């Protein structure tokens, strides 16, 4: 009755289908996190389904927690030694007097106490309802508070996130990041991921060797029924098929059990694996080995990976990486045709068949010039995000310059003019005026009316650098926003003073607590 993937579970760390390097890295990181004052506070494990994240975490906990757990002096709840190596959060718990969004908080505020004599590894695999915006914000805030907390002691925190796609559903119309992919990036934020006290280790699909070994072990364990049903002599091939069909150990074991239990002969199938972004780009550019008909491959990709192929990110990636075919040494006519096709697809208002046309054109063009003697380049993510960030910084700087101009010279200009001519001419003029002001001041000191206009240039307010930086071609935002706010406040104060016409201060007069 018991399913094999549960019946044949690892009993020790040596039976986990995990590569040696990844296992060693996880061991080292987790051991470091268990130290009295550990630099790392959270272990973020991300990977596909059935890659043995929770399994390896539990197996390592079973060995590590007993080593560091401080001995008790009869303070255990029950006579038992409190076999609670791992404490996990349950997302479907509904207590009476508690709002739903506050559930995880109530867990975390308890988890902090599982240290020293009550040491326990905090595992977060069943996440709260992060699809709810408010719940996700609360979860992120709680994680940040844990990272920025100020307690001398905290228990190790492990978050295992199974990265998977969210199929396009009718009941959902929003198009946020989490609505497309359920991964660490969409669940967490930049601040948490980039925190110095958080360590992220990415898991990989289980390789064919480990899958074959474990499937062979499972088959050897069940020998009576396999021999009786006359499936032993042909077991190997089946295992091989599984080994080359899926990287999910649980799915592989389920498929093996389903095949073995069947009295007749049913075709062997496993769960489908989504094609990654770079894998999809490679399929579109260089083709697929498993298929020779391009039409069939493209139809399968569109039917199984419509969500990934519909976004403009895939089109931008194709535009960015189409030149890596032969390191760029291929006919320019093919590149022109590809780019023209992508441009014309851009005008089709994101219809699915526009994407079909673009991908099929790229595939046909690359197949036409395909040859055995080809050397490829490196695939890179398109840099549209960097351009957007630079544009945002430019907008902030232009707003700051406009505020300065308005509040110091009674001049209002369009942002278009700032982008076109002012953003280069004005900083240069201010810089040269400041240089001449320094020269004149030094000359006068050594020894204003002649160059009173130059004397009116203030170095602390007037912008003397090109907006957005120099154009380096052919030879973060919070700080700029705060600087703009400070300059705006200073300008307002100066304007008010003209109209009518400080922590050091607090430190100089400490409060007096006289009773």
């Amino acid at each position: 009755g018991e399913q094999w993937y549960e019946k044949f579970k690892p009993n020790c760390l040596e039976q986990v289908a995990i590569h040696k390097r990844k296992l060693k890295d996880v061991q080292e990181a987790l051991d470091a996190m268990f130290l009295p004052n550990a630099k790392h506070r959270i272990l973020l494990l991300s990977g596909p389904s059935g890659c043995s994240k929770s399994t390896v975490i539990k197996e390592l906990s079973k060995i590590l927690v007993p080593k560091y757990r401080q001995n008790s002096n009869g303070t255990s709840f029950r006579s038992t030694p409190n076999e609670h190596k791992v404490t996990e959060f349950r997302g479907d718990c509904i207590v009476n007097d508690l709002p739903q969004m506050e559930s995880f908080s109530e867990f975390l505020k308890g988890a902090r106490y599982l240290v020293m004599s009550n040491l326990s590894l905090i595992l977060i695999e069943d996440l709260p309802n992060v699809f709810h915006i408010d719940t996700r914000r609360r979860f992120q805030q709680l994680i940040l508070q844990w990272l920025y907390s100020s307690e001398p002691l905290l228990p190790p925190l492990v978050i295992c996130i199974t990265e998977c796609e969210i199929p396009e559903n009718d009941n959902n119309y929003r198009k946020f990041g989490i609505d497309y992919t359920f991964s660490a990036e969409t669940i967490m934020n930049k601040e948490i991921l980039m925190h110095p006290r958080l360590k992220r280790i990415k898991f990989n699909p289980i390789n064919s060797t480990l899958l074959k070994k474990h499937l062979k072990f499972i088959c050897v364990q069940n020998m009576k029924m396999l021999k009786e049903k006359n499936k032993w002599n042909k077991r190997q091939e089946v295992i091989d098929y599984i080994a080359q069909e899926t990287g999910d150990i649980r799915s592989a074991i389920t498929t093996l059990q389903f095949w073995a239990t069947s009295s007749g002969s049913l075709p062997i199938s496993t769960r489908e694996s989504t094609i990654s972004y770079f894998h999809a780009i490679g399929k579109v550019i260089h083709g697929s080995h498993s298929t020779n008909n391009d039409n069939e491959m493209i139809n399968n990709l569109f039917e199984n990976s419509n969500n990934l192929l519909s976004k403009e990110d895939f089109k931008l990636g194709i535009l960015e990486n189409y030149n890596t075919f032969n390191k760029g040494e291929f006919s320019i006519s093919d590149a022109s045709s590809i780019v023209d096709c992508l441009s014309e697809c851009d005008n089709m208002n994101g219809l699915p068949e526009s994407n079909e046309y673009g991908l099929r054109e790229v595939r046909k063009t690359f197949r036409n010039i395909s040859k055995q003697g080809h050397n490829h380049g490196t695939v890179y993510f398109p840099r549209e995000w960097k351009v957007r960030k630079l544009q945002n910084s430019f907008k902030v700087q232009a707003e700051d310059w406009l505020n300065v101009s308005l509040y110091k010279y009674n001049a209002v200009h369009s942002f278009r003019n700032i982008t076109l001519e002012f953003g280069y001419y004005a900083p240069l003029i201010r810089k040269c005026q400041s240089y001449k002001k320094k020269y004149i001041l030094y000359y006068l000191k050594n020894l204003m009316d002649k160059f009173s206009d130059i004397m009116k240039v203030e170095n602390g307010i007037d912008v003397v650098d090109r907006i957005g930086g120099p154009i380096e071609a052919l030879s973060h935002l919070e700080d700029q926003k705060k600087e703009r706010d400070r300059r705006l406040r200073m300008l307002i104060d100066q304007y008010e003073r003209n109209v009518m016409m400080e922590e050091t201060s607090f430190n100089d007069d400490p409060i007096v607590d006289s009773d």
Binding site: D493, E502, F506, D508, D509, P510, I511, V512, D513, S514
Partner: protein, 293 residues
């Protein structure tokens, strides 16, 4: 910088009620409030601009309320500006109110203390007894810079385009009737934007309207309404603002109303005190045109 205030609910109940009303009103509008402790009076400000749109509340309490009032600072007029969470002070004030209701003569002592255990951030050490159990509260607060305090200013209302309306005392024979008049519109579900109108020549009359493609609500007042020493003055305001005004009217006696046509609404409350007469504490509420004509 030294801050020390002593309050006794039993003595001068009227000013204690004034403080209760100010705290409740500020806590029922937003999350944080500005407290300016001056050598002469205490100002409590609830404004959107902190450290149509929502209205603003300004409460002035004379220094004579506090039995002990020690305010020392290095700034002009010994002004100390603070930003405090309304909920914490409101909870402390409920605790003190129930302690007094139980029956006691204890005094509430408020001091400003520095917190090295935790824009400097300090604490208010509100302490009072309860017959004995010592009640202490360290309410977090943020010290506000002189320039930032100067930024916040009282709104100014034109006095040539504005006409004042005197309301009957709550303790008078018409007080209950006028309170019911005010609350008439606080029992309709979908109503969110009421339309106040004032007509000159009962010397003056005040009406409340709600116009909709399906509904037409209209409430008249027939009692004697006086005008404080041309007949078309209308303003549309949210129901929350009217409810706040309703709650305010139930506490004070010399309540005054003003409608700046299609501009705003002003709700003034004063508390007379005998002695020349002592400084008159005030509560002024400004409401912006929710929709407008």
């Amino acid at each position: 910088m030294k801050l020390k205030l002593i309050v006794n609910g039993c003595e001068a109940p009227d000013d204690y009620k004034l403080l209760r009303t100010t705290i409740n009103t500020v806590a029922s509008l937003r999350k944080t409030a500005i407290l300016r402790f001056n050598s002469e009076r205490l100002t409590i400000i609830s404004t959107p601009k902190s450290s149509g749109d929502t209205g603003q509340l300004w409460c002035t309490i004379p220094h004579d309320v506090f039995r002990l009032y020690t305010v020392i600072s290095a700034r002009e007029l010994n002004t100390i500006t603070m930003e405090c969470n309304c909920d914490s002070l409101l909870s402390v004030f409920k605790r003190y109110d129930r302690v007094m209701n139980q029956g006691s003569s204890s005094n509430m002592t408020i001091k400003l203390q520095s917190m090295p255990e935790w824009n400097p951030i300090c604490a208010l050490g509100i302490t009072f007894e309860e017959i004995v159990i010592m009640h202490s509260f360290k309410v977090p607060v943020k010290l506000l810079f002189r320039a930032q305090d100067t930024r916040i200013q009282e709104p100014m209302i034109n006095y040539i385009q504005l006409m004042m309306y005197k309301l009957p005392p709550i303790s008078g024979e018409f007080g209950s009737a006028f309170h019911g008049f005010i609350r008439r519109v606080e029992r309709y579900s979908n109503v969110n934007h009421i339309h106040l109108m004032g007509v000159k020549k009962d010397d003056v009359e005040l009406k409340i309207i709600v116009n909709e493609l399906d509904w037409h609500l209209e409430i008249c007042w027939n009692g004697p309404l006086d005008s404080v020493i041309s007949s078309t003055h209308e303003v549309i305001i949210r129901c929350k603002d009217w409810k706040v005004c309703s709650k305010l009217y139930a506490a004070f006696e010399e309540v005054v109303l003003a409608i700046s046509h299609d501009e705003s609404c002003v709700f003034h409350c004063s508390l007379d005190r005998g002695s020349k007469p002592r400084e008159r504490g005030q509560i002024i509420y400004y409401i912006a045109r929710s929709k407008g004509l």
